[PDB]
Amino acid sequence: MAGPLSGLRVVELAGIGPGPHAAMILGDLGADVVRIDRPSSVDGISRDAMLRNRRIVTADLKSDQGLELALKLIAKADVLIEGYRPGVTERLGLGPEECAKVNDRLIYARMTGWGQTGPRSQQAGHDINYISLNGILHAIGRGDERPVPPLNLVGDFGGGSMFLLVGILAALWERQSSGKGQVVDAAMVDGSSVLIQMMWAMRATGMWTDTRGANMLDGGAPYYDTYECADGRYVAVGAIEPQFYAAMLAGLGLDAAELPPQNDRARWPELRALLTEAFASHDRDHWGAVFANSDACVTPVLAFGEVHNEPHIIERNTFYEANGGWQPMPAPRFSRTASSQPRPPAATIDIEAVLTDWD
Amino acid sequence: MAGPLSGLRVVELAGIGPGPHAAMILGDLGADVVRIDRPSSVDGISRDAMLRNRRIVTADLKSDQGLELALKLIAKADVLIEGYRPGVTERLGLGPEECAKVNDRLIYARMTGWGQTGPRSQQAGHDINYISLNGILHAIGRGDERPVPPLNLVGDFGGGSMFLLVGILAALWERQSSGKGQVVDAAMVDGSSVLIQMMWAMRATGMWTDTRGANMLDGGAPYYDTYECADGRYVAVGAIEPQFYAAMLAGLGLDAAELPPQNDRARWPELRALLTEAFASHDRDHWGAVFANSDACVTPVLAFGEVHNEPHIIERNTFYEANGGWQPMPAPRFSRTASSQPRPPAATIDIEAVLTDWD
Ligand SMILES: COc1ccc2ccc([C@H](C)C(=O)SCCNC(=O)CCNC(=O)[C@@H](O)C(C)(C)COP(=O)(O)OP(=O)(O)OC[C@H]3O[C@@H](n4cnc5c(N)ncnc54)[C@H](O)[C@@H]3OP(=O)(O)O)cc2c1
Ligand SMILES: COc1ccc2ccc([C@H](C)C(=O)SCCNC(=O)CCNC(=O)[C@@H](O)C(C)(C)COP(=O)(O)OP(=O)(O)OC[C@H]3O[C@@H](n4cnc5c(N)ncnc54)[C@H](O)[C@@H]3OP(=O)(O)O)cc2c1
C-alpha cells in the first residue's frame, strides 16, 4: 500500500461528515482502513466517493457477536474513529475504557461537534450549528444581509476532520515514546475556533470588527473580493500588498492618481465603484489572460464543471477521473513515499476475512 | 512542555498565513518551535497571538553567518516549515538538498498556494485566489449575488495549514520505520480540494449543482440556513434529518400538513417564506431558549464579542483570556498528554542560546 501511512491500521465506526472524511484521508495516505457499518445500511457498492480507500464490513454492534468481532478488530488496530454522540460507544461496550482493556496502544479518536461534556453535548447539530456558537458564521457574508454558510467546509472539515487527523497523528508520535495510546477529543466547536485564530488575533489588536462585510478579508476591502465581469462571470481579487495592487491597477487601465488610496477605508465606496466599473468592462477570460503570470492576484472564479479545463489544475494532477466525476487526488504530497490513486468503494467483506488478513 | 508533541523540534522560516498557523498548532501541542524572522521586521514583543508557543530569533538569511546559524538549527531539528515561493529557500542555500546534507532525518515542509511547479507556481496570491481556481469560491454565497469569500478559512487554514500538519505528522510516522525524512509539498489549491471532497462526491451522484444558492449545504435549503429574528439577530437552522426538521417545525408552531415537503426543491421559496415569518416573530434569545436540549438543530448565531458569555463555551474552556482578549485553547484535546495554556509571544532571543539548549 502506497504512501507515508503504509502499515497504519484503522477501524472506523461508520458515521457522517468529519469521521468519514478523516478516515478517507488516512486511507488516501496509505493507511489500512476498515469501516464497520450496520447491516441495515450495507446494500451494494457505495456510490459515495468519500468512502474510497476502505474495506467495508457489516456488524450489528448491539448484538453480542457484533460487539465481540468489533473488539477483535480494535484489538489488532492502531486507531479507532467514532463520531456518534457522547455515551454511544460506552453503551455499545466499545467505549475508551473497554478498548483500553483489549489494546492499550489504541488511539481512540472521538469526532463530535459540541464535545464530550457540557450543556449542548447531547444536542443534534450540523456544521452550521457548531460555527454559529463560536462567532464564525456571523462573520461570513455581505453586511446588508444575513450570514451565509461557507458550505460545511469550516466546521465539518477544516475545524473537524482535520483536527481529528492532527490529534490521531500527534498521538501516534506520542505513542513512540510511551508505548501507550490515548483518547483524542476532537470537537468542531474547538477545532473551528483554532481554525479562525487569526481573526481572534486581529480582533485583539483592533484590526477586525464584529461588523460583517467591513474587514480586510470578509469582502469589505475592494482589493479582497470578487467582481462581476462583462459576461456575468466573476474574478477574484486578492491584492493585499501594495505592489500587487499597483500591478492590478495597471492591468485594469486605472491610474493610481485618479483613485482614492488603497487603504483609505472612508473612501472604499468610491474605490469599489471604480474597480467595479473597470472589471465590468471585459469578460472573465479577458481578465484571466491579461493577468496570467502576474502578481496582480486576480484569478478567474471557476465553477466546479470548468475546473478540469484549467492548465494549472491539469498539470499538477490535482484531480483524477472516477465513475462520471472528477475527484481530488490525495493531499498533501510526499517526495519519497508518494500516495497512489485512491481505490474506489469496494463491495463488502466478511469481518472474519479481515481478522485473518490482520493475523 | 505539555502535550503529545513534547520533544518535537521545529524550525519555522517566518512567512504569513498558513505556515505560521501550522507552526502555532505544533507549538500548541507541545512542540519546540523556533521561528527565524529577519532583523528588520522585529521591535518589541510581537502583538500577533498567532506567534504564541514560539521562540523568535532573527537572522539575515542572506548573510553567510545567518545561513550558517540556520543550518545549525535545522541540523538539530525534526521539521522545517517554509512558506515562500518555490525556489526561494534553494537560493538561500536552505533548500531540501542542502538540509538533507546536514540532517537526512528532517521533515521538509513546504507551504504554498499553487504548488512547487506548474504555470501558476510563481504567481503571488492569497486564499481568495487559490479557492477561485478549484470551484470552491464559486459555490459560496447567495444565488443572486457575486461569490463571497469565507474569510481566509478554507485556503489558508482548512485546506492549507491543516494539510501541512497532516503531512508533517504523517511523515514523522513514516520516518519511525524508514529512518529518513522527506519533503512535504502542501499546496492550498490541493488541500482545499480534498477539503471539499464531499461536494465532488455529491456532484458525481447528481446531488450537487454548480448553481450557487441551490444546494443542501450552501444556504439554498430552507432547513440549512440562517434566519433573521425579531430583534435583527440571527439563528442558524441545520435540521437536515427529517426527525430533527419535524422537531424544529413543532417548536416554530408550524403544522407540517400546511407546509410543502421538506425536500421539494421547487417549493423551497415558499417553504422559506413560511419559516422566515415564523422565526421573525421572536428574538434570537427566545429561540435559543425554546430549542435548548432539542434535536431541532437551531442555534443562536453569536458575534465574536458574545462568545465569552455562552455557557457551553465557558464550561468547556474553548477559550482563555490573554493579551487584549480571548483566544482559542489548543485543539484537539488529549486524555493523557494534555496540552497546556499557550505561552504568549516571546521576546526575541539569541540564536546561539537556542543552539546551546539543543546541543
Ligand atoms: C442524512 O444523510 C446525510 C449524509 C451525509 C451528510 C454529511 C454531512 C452532513 C452535515 C453538515 C453534517 O453536519 S455531518 C456532522 C453531524 N454531526 C456529528 O457528527 C456530531 C456528533 N454526532 C452527532 O451528534 C450525530 O450522531 C447526529 C447528530 C447525526 C445524531 O444522530 P443519531 O442518528 O441520533 O445517532 P447517534 O450518534 O446519537 O446514535 C447512533 C445510533 O446508532 C447505533 N449504531 C451505530 N452503529 C451501529 C451498528 N453497526 N449496529 C447497530 N447500532 C449501531 C448506536 O448504537 C446509536 O443507537 P442508540 O443511541 O439509539 O442506542 C449531513 C449529512 C447527511
Ligand atoms: C501584509 O500583511 C499581512 C499579514 C498577515 C496576512 C495573513 C493572510 C493573508 C492572506 C489571506 C494570505 O492568503 S496568506 C497566504 C499568502 N500566500 C502564500 O503564502 C503562498 C506562498 N507564498 C507566496 O506566494 C508569498 O511568498 C507571497 C505571495 C506573499 C510572495 O511575496 P514575496 O514577498 O515576493 O516573498 P517571496 O516568498 O517571493 O520571497 C520572500 C523573500 O524574503 C527573503 N527572506 C525570507 N526570510 C528572510 C530572512 N530571514 N532574511 C533575509 N531575507 C529573507 C527571501 O530570501 C526572499 O527573497 P527573494 O526576494 O530573493 O526571492 C495576508 C496577510 C497579510
Short mmCIF file of N, CA, C and O in Angstrom, two decimals, chain B residues 109-198:
data_model
loop_
_atom_site.label_atom_id
_atom_site.label_comp_id
_atom_site.label_asym_id
_atom_site.label_seq_id
_atom_site.Cartn_x
_atom_site.Cartn_y
_atom_site.Cartn_z
N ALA B 109 9.00 20.79 5.05
CA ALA B 109 7.58 21.07 4.87
C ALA B 109 7.39 22.40 4.14
O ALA B 109 7.68 23.46 4.70
N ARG B 110 6.90 22.30 2.92
CA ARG B 110 6.73 23.43 2.01
C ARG B 110 5.26 23.78 1.81
O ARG B 110 4.51 23.01 1.23
N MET B 111 4.89 24.98 2.28
CA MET B 111 3.54 25.51 2.31
C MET B 111 3.39 26.58 1.22
O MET B 111 3.90 27.68 1.36
N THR B 112 2.71 26.22 0.15
CA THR B 112 2.41 27.18 -0.91
C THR B 112 0.92 27.19 -1.23
O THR B 112 0.16 26.31 -0.81
N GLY B 113 0.50 28.17 -2.04
CA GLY B 113 -0.85 28.14 -2.58
C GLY B 113 -0.96 27.28 -3.83
O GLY B 113 -1.89 26.48 -3.99
N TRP B 114 -0.04 27.48 -4.77
CA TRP B 114 -0.19 26.90 -6.10
C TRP B 114 0.61 25.61 -6.27
O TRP B 114 0.43 24.92 -7.29
N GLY B 115 1.51 25.30 -5.34
CA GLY B 115 2.36 24.12 -5.50
C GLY B 115 3.81 24.48 -5.87
O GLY B 115 4.20 25.66 -5.97
N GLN B 116 4.60 23.42 -6.08
CA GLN B 116 6.03 23.56 -6.30
C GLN B 116 6.33 23.80 -7.78
O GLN B 116 7.31 24.44 -8.08
N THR B 117 5.49 23.32 -8.69
CA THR B 117 5.71 23.52 -10.10
C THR B 117 4.39 23.89 -10.77
O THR B 117 3.35 24.04 -10.13
N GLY B 118 4.47 24.11 -12.09
CA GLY B 118 3.30 24.39 -12.89
C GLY B 118 3.17 25.88 -13.17
O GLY B 118 3.85 26.72 -12.57
N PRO B 119 2.28 26.23 -14.12
CA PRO B 119 2.25 27.55 -14.71
C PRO B 119 1.96 28.67 -13.73
O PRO B 119 2.42 29.78 -13.97
N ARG B 120 1.31 28.36 -12.60
CA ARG B 120 0.93 29.42 -11.68
C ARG B 120 1.89 29.45 -10.51
O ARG B 120 1.70 30.24 -9.61
N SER B 121 2.97 28.67 -10.56
CA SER B 121 3.76 28.41 -9.36
C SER B 121 4.53 29.63 -8.89
O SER B 121 4.93 29.64 -7.74
N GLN B 122 4.72 30.63 -9.76
CA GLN B 122 5.41 31.83 -9.31
C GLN B 122 4.47 33.00 -9.09
O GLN B 122 4.93 34.06 -8.68
N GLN B 123 3.18 32.81 -9.31
CA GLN B 123 2.24 33.90 -9.14
C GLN B 123 2.04 34.20 -7.66
O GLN B 123 1.81 33.30 -6.87
N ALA B 124 2.07 35.49 -7.31
CA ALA B 124 1.63 35.89 -6.00
C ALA B 124 0.15 35.53 -5.87
O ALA B 124 -0.57 35.45 -6.86
N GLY B 125 -0.29 35.33 -4.63
CA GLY B 125 -1.69 35.01 -4.38
C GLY B 125 -2.03 35.00 -2.89
O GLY B 125 -1.14 34.97 -2.03
N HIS B 126 -3.33 35.12 -2.62
CA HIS B 126 -3.87 34.86 -1.30
C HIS B 126 -4.99 33.82 -1.40
O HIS B 126 -5.37 33.35 -2.49
N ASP B 127 -5.51 33.46 -0.22
CA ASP B 127 -6.59 32.50 -0.04
C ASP B 127 -7.63 32.63 -1.14
O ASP B 127 -7.88 31.69 -1.87
N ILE B 128 -8.20 33.82 -1.30
CA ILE B 128 -9.28 34.01 -2.26
C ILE B 128 -8.88 33.55 -3.67
O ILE B 128 -9.72 33.05 -4.40
N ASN B 129 -7.61 33.72 -4.07
CA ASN B 129 -7.19 33.28 -5.39
C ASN B 129 -7.13 31.76 -5.49
O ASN B 129 -7.52 31.21 -6.52
N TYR B 130 -6.55 31.08 -4.48
CA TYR B 130 -6.40 29.62 -4.54
C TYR B 130 -7.78 28.93 -4.62
O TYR B 130 -7.97 28.00 -5.40
N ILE B 131 -8.77 29.45 -3.87
CA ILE B 131 -10.10 28.84 -3.87
C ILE B 131 -10.92 29.28 -5.08
O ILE B 131 -11.94 28.66 -5.41
N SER B 132 -10.46 30.30 -5.81
CA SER B 132 -11.20 30.66 -7.00
C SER B 132 -10.96 29.64 -8.10
O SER B 132 -11.82 29.37 -8.94
N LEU B 133 -9.78 29.00 -8.12
CA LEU B 133 -9.42 28.20 -9.28
C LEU B 133 -10.02 26.80 -9.26
O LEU B 133 -10.03 26.12 -10.28
N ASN B 134 -10.43 26.31 -8.09
CA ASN B 134 -10.78 24.92 -7.95
C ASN B 134 -12.25 24.71 -7.63
O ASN B 134 -12.63 23.62 -7.19
N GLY B 135 -13.07 25.74 -7.83
CA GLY B 135 -14.52 25.56 -7.80
C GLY B 135 -15.13 25.99 -6.47
O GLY B 135 -16.33 26.13 -6.36
N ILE B 136 -14.29 26.23 -5.47
CA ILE B 136 -14.79 26.41 -4.11
C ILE B 136 -15.46 27.77 -3.98
O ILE B 136 -16.59 27.84 -3.49
N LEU B 137 -14.78 28.85 -4.40
CA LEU B 137 -15.29 30.19 -4.18
C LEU B 137 -16.60 30.39 -4.93
O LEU B 137 -17.52 31.03 -4.44
N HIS B 138 -16.70 29.82 -6.11
CA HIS B 138 -17.89 29.98 -6.93
C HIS B 138 -19.14 29.46 -6.21
O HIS B 138 -20.25 29.95 -6.46
N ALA B 139 -18.94 28.53 -5.27
CA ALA B 139 -20.05 27.82 -4.66
C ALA B 139 -20.55 28.51 -3.40
O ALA B 139 -21.56 28.09 -2.84
N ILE B 140 -19.87 29.56 -2.97
CA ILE B 140 -20.16 30.18 -1.70
C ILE B 140 -20.86 31.52 -1.88
O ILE B 140 -20.31 32.44 -2.49
N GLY B 141 -22.06 31.66 -1.30
CA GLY B 141 -22.76 32.94 -1.25
C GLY B 141 -24.19 32.80 -1.78
O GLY B 141 -24.62 31.72 -2.11
N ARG B 142 -24.98 33.89 -1.80
CA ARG B 142 -26.33 33.82 -2.34
C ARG B 142 -26.32 33.77 -3.87
O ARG B 142 -25.41 34.31 -4.51
N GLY B 143 -27.37 33.17 -4.44
CA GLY B 143 -27.50 32.93 -5.87
C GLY B 143 -27.63 34.21 -6.69
O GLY B 143 -27.17 34.27 -7.83
N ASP B 144 -28.20 35.26 -6.10
CA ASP B 144 -28.46 36.47 -6.87
C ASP B 144 -27.30 37.47 -6.78
O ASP B 144 -27.47 38.62 -7.16
N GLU B 145 -26.13 37.05 -6.28
CA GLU B 145 -25.07 37.97 -5.95
C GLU B 145 -23.71 37.35 -6.26
O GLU B 145 -23.59 36.17 -6.50
N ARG B 146 -22.67 38.16 -6.21
CA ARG B 146 -21.36 37.61 -6.52
C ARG B 146 -20.86 36.76 -5.35
O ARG B 146 -21.24 36.98 -4.21
N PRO B 147 -19.97 35.78 -5.61
CA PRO B 147 -19.49 34.92 -4.54
C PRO B 147 -18.86 35.72 -3.42
O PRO B 147 -18.26 36.78 -3.65
N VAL B 148 -18.93 35.19 -2.21
CA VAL B 148 -18.39 35.90 -1.07
C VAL B 148 -17.27 35.05 -0.47
O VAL B 148 -17.38 33.83 -0.36
N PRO B 149 -16.13 35.66 -0.12
CA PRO B 149 -15.04 34.90 0.46
C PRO B 149 -15.40 34.43 1.87
O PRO B 149 -15.85 35.22 2.69
N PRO B 150 -15.21 33.14 2.17
CA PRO B 150 -15.40 32.63 3.51
C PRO B 150 -14.20 32.95 4.38
O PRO B 150 -13.45 32.07 4.82
N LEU B 151 -14.03 34.24 4.59
CA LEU B 151 -12.81 34.77 5.14
C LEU B 151 -11.65 34.09 4.42
O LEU B 151 -11.77 33.77 3.24
N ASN B 152 -10.56 33.83 5.16
CA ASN B 152 -9.47 33.04 4.63
C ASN B 152 -9.39 31.72 5.38
O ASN B 152 -8.30 31.21 5.63
N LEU B 153 -10.56 31.13 5.68
CA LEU B 153 -10.59 29.90 6.44
C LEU B 153 -10.34 28.67 5.58
O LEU B 153 -9.93 27.64 6.13
N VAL B 154 -10.70 28.69 4.28
CA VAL B 154 -10.73 27.45 3.52
C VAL B 154 -9.40 27.19 2.80
O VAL B 154 -8.99 26.05 2.63
N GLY B 155 -8.71 28.24 2.35
CA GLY B 155 -7.46 28.02 1.62
C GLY B 155 -6.25 28.04 2.55
O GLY B 155 -5.40 27.15 2.51
N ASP B 156 -6.15 29.10 3.34
CA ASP B 156 -5.04 29.27 4.25
C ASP B 156 -5.03 28.18 5.32
O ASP B 156 -3.98 27.65 5.66
N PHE B 157 -6.19 27.89 5.92
CA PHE B 157 -6.15 27.10 7.15
C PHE B 157 -6.68 25.70 6.90
O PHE B 157 -5.91 24.74 6.88
N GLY B 158 -7.99 25.60 6.63
CA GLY B 158 -8.63 24.32 6.40
C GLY B 158 -7.93 23.50 5.33
O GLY B 158 -7.75 22.29 5.50
N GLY B 159 -7.63 24.13 4.18
CA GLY B 159 -7.04 23.40 3.07
C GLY B 159 -5.54 23.68 2.94
O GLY B 159 -4.93 23.33 1.94
N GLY B 160 -4.99 24.38 3.93
CA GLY B 160 -3.65 24.92 3.89
C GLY B 160 -2.80 24.37 5.04
O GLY B 160 -2.19 23.31 4.89
N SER B 161 -2.73 25.16 6.12
CA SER B 161 -2.04 24.79 7.34
C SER B 161 -2.38 23.36 7.76
O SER B 161 -1.48 22.59 8.08
N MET B 162 -3.66 22.97 7.71
CA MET B 162 -4.06 21.70 8.30
C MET B 162 -3.50 20.55 7.49
O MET B 162 -3.21 19.49 8.05
N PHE B 163 -3.42 20.73 6.16
CA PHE B 163 -2.80 19.74 5.30
C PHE B 163 -1.28 19.74 5.49
O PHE B 163 -0.68 18.67 5.51
N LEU B 164 -0.65 20.89 5.73
CA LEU B 164 0.77 20.87 6.07
C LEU B 164 0.98 20.00 7.33
O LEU B 164 1.86 19.13 7.37
N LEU B 165 0.15 20.20 8.36
CA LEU B 165 0.22 19.45 9.61
C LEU B 165 0.00 17.95 9.41
O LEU B 165 0.80 17.14 9.88
N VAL B 166 -1.06 17.58 8.71
CA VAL B 166 -1.26 16.16 8.45
C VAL B 166 -0.02 15.58 7.76
O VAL B 166 0.30 14.41 7.96
N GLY B 167 0.62 16.38 6.88
CA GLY B 167 1.80 15.92 6.17
C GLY B 167 3.01 15.81 7.10
O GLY B 167 3.75 14.85 7.05
N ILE B 168 3.26 16.82 7.91
CA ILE B 168 4.40 16.77 8.80
C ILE B 168 4.27 15.53 9.69
O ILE B 168 5.20 14.72 9.76
N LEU B 169 3.07 15.31 10.26
CA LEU B 169 2.88 14.27 11.25
C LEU B 169 2.83 12.91 10.59
O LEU B 169 3.37 11.96 11.14
N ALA B 170 2.29 12.80 9.37
CA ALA B 170 2.31 11.51 8.70
C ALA B 170 3.74 11.14 8.31
O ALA B 170 4.08 9.96 8.26
N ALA B 171 4.57 12.13 7.99
CA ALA B 171 5.91 11.83 7.53
C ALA B 171 6.75 11.42 8.74
O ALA B 171 7.61 10.57 8.60
N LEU B 172 6.46 11.97 9.93
CA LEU B 172 7.11 11.52 11.15
C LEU B 172 6.79 10.05 11.44
O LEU B 172 7.67 9.29 11.83
N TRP B 173 5.55 9.65 11.21
CA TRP B 173 5.16 8.26 11.34
C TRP B 173 5.95 7.39 10.36
O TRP B 173 6.40 6.30 10.73
N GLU B 174 6.08 7.83 9.10
CA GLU B 174 6.78 7.04 8.09
C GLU B 174 8.26 6.89 8.48
O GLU B 174 8.85 5.83 8.26
N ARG B 175 8.84 7.94 9.05
CA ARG B 175 10.24 8.02 9.43
C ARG B 175 10.59 6.98 10.49
O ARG B 175 11.70 6.44 10.48
N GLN B 176 9.66 6.72 11.42
CA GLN B 176 9.91 5.79 12.51
C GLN B 176 10.25 4.39 11.97
O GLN B 176 10.97 3.65 12.61
N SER B 177 9.76 4.03 10.79
CA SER B 177 10.11 2.75 10.21
C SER B 177 11.10 2.87 9.04
O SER B 177 11.55 1.86 8.53
N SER B 178 11.46 4.09 8.61
CA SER B 178 12.37 4.18 7.47
C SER B 178 13.69 4.83 7.87
O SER B 178 14.68 4.69 7.16
N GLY B 179 13.71 5.56 8.99
CA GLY B 179 14.90 6.24 9.48
C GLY B 179 15.20 7.54 8.75
O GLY B 179 16.18 8.21 9.06
N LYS B 180 14.32 7.92 7.80
CA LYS B 180 14.57 9.01 6.87
C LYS B 180 13.44 10.04 6.91
O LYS B 180 12.27 9.68 7.06
N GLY B 181 13.81 11.31 6.71
CA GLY B 181 12.86 12.36 6.41
C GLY B 181 12.43 12.35 4.94
O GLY B 181 12.66 11.38 4.22
N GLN B 182 11.75 13.44 4.54
CA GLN B 182 11.29 13.63 3.17
C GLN B 182 10.63 15.01 3.04
O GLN B 182 10.58 15.80 3.99
N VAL B 183 10.19 15.30 1.81
CA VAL B 183 9.61 16.61 1.53
C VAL B 183 8.09 16.48 1.47
O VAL B 183 7.55 15.61 0.77
N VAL B 184 7.45 17.39 2.21
CA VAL B 184 6.01 17.56 2.17
C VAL B 184 5.71 18.82 1.39
O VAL B 184 6.09 19.93 1.79
N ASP B 185 4.97 18.61 0.30
CA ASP B 185 4.51 19.67 -0.57
C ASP B 185 3.01 19.86 -0.34
O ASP B 185 2.20 19.14 -0.92
N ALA B 186 2.68 20.86 0.49
CA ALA B 186 1.30 21.23 0.77
C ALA B 186 0.91 22.48 -0.02
O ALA B 186 1.28 23.61 0.32
N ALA B 187 0.12 22.24 -1.05
CA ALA B 187 -0.46 23.33 -1.83
C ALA B 187 -1.92 23.58 -1.44
O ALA B 187 -2.74 22.67 -1.50
N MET B 188 -2.26 24.85 -1.12
CA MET B 188 -3.62 25.21 -0.73
C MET B 188 -4.65 24.82 -1.79
O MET B 188 -5.79 24.45 -1.47
N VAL B 189 -4.25 24.80 -3.07
CA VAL B 189 -5.21 24.51 -4.12
C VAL B 189 -5.56 23.01 -4.09
O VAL B 189 -6.68 22.63 -4.48
N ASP B 190 -4.62 22.18 -3.60
CA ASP B 190 -4.84 20.74 -3.45
C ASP B 190 -5.61 20.42 -2.16
O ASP B 190 -6.60 19.69 -2.17
N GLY B 191 -5.09 20.89 -1.03
CA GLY B 191 -5.68 20.66 0.27
C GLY B 191 -7.14 21.11 0.29
O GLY B 191 -7.99 20.40 0.83
N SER B 192 -7.42 22.30 -0.25
CA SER B 192 -8.76 22.81 -0.17
C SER B 192 -9.65 21.97 -1.08
O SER B 192 -10.83 21.79 -0.76
N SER B 193 -9.10 21.38 -2.15
CA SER B 193 -9.88 20.46 -2.98
C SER B 193 -10.25 19.18 -2.22
O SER B 193 -11.34 18.62 -2.36
N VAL B 194 -9.35 18.65 -1.41
CA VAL B 194 -9.67 17.46 -0.64
C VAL B 194 -10.62 17.87 0.46
O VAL B 194 -11.47 17.08 0.90
N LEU B 195 -10.47 19.11 0.93
CA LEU B 195 -11.33 19.61 1.99
C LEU B 195 -12.79 19.55 1.56
O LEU B 195 -13.64 19.27 2.38
N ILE B 196 -13.05 19.82 0.27
CA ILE B 196 -14.38 19.91 -0.30
C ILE B 196 -14.71 18.64 -1.07
O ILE B 196 -15.58 18.63 -1.92
N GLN B 197 -14.05 17.53 -0.75
CA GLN B 197 -14.35 16.28 -1.44
C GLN B 197 -15.84 15.88 -1.35
O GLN B 197 -16.38 15.27 -2.29
N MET B 198 -16.51 16.19 -0.24
CA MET B 198 -17.92 15.84 -0.13
C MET B 198 -18.73 16.43 -1.29
O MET B 198 -19.59 15.74 -1.82
#
